[PDB]
Design a protein around this ligand. Structure first.
Ligand SMILES: Nc1ncnc2c1ncn2[C@@H]1O[C@H](COP(=O)(O)OP(=O)(O)OP(=O)(O)O)[C@@H](O)[C@H]1O
Ligand SMILES: [Mg+2]
Ligand SMILES: [Mg+2]
Length: 292
């Protein structure tokens, strides 16, 4: 851990961020550290700062991996990592603040139309194609990790579970996902590849249609058995959906990994071309924020 802390020291900016940020507002406090909203004293930019007590953190190497991945994989559809600091045992990670809450807020509080869903799926797919082409699998894709700007900007967060693969080693085994969003091969096979993120996107699309992933009310172990054996989840009112959307869903939620679309393939899908401007999400985001 002397080694790990020293590695962290080389990554972070020097000194105390306490001078550099003002008006901290706690917006989270659980497990992964404390998250605050705050203002960059210099720029006026509003930021989100996660604070972690390192001696409490079980697996520090994952946090190191998270920061390195964020630093070197900047993208308009990924929440911007701005800076980090280490003050004794206290690690600070500073992110851009997304004032629009999360996709979960939206899908639980409002009712998205197909044009709005196509826009969100597109932005998510842009992040995934980029990540997968840089040999990064996110592994925990879910509506909670999709953060929104008031302008309808869609951005991926939470790189604590990501895998850095190779063209040589395309496959991973570690169990890191969230059960309801997990692709079947995660539990039915010894290993899995980047297309687990595509399946998770499929389940998010279902969240946007129906308000929840399949099996949400089941215990996660029961759910996992259902995912593993039932395969392609069933829809409540399939006939209410456009043919193009249904096709898109089917490509994401193929049981046969080889048959499931890759990010690069799905980017070309015609469902995405019905996308409304991202700005159309603003009213839902505003309503969700209020209700929330
Ligand atoms: N960059 C950010 N901008 C705006 N809000 C954020 C940002 N990062 C995190 N949050 C919000 O702060 C809260 C705490 O986030 P946290 O890191 O605990 O993730 P989480 O979604 O709570 O995951 P967990 O299941 O680990 O609690 C969440 O409501 C999250 O949406
Ligand atoms: Mg999360
Ligand atoms: Mg998170």
């Amino acid at each position: 851990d002397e080694e790990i802390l020293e590695k962290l020291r080389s990554i972070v900016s020097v000194g105390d961020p306490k001078k550099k940020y003002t008006r901290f507002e706690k917006i989270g406090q659980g497990a992964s550290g404390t998250v605050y909203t705050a203002m960059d004293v210099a720029t006026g930019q509003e930021v989100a700062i996660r604070q972690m007590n390192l001696q409490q953190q079980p697996k520090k190497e994952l946090i190191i991996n998270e920061i390195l991945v964020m630093r070197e994989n900047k993208n308009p559809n990924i929440v911007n990592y701005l800076d980090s600091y280490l003050v004794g045992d206290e690690l600070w990670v500073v992110m851009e603040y997304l004032a629009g809450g999360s996709l979960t807020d939206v899908v639980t509080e409002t009712c998205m139309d197909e044009g709005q869903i196509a826009a969100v799926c597109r932005e998510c797919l842009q992040a995934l194609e980029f990540l997968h082409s840089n040999q990064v699998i996110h592994r925990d894709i879910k509506s909670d990790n999709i953060l929104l700007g008031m302008d309808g900007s869609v951005k991926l967060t939470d790189f604590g579970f990501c895998a850095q693969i190779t063209p040589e080693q395309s496959k991973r085994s570690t169990m890191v996902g969230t059960p309801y969003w997990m692709a079947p091969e995660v539990v039915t096979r010894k290993a899995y590849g980047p297309k687990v993120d595509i399946w998770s996107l499929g389940i998010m699309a279902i969240e946007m249609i129906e308000g929840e992933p399949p099996y949400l009310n089941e215990n996660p172990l029961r759910a996992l058995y259902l995912i593993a054996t039932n395969g392609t989840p069933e829809l409540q009112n399939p006939e209410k959906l456009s043919a193009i959307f249904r096709d898109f869903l089917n490509r994401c939620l193929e049981m046969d990994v080889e048959k499931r679309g890759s990010a690069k393939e799905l980017i070309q899908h015609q469902f995405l071309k019905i996308a409304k401007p991202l700005s159309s999400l603003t009213p839902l985001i505003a309503a969700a924020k209020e209700a929330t």
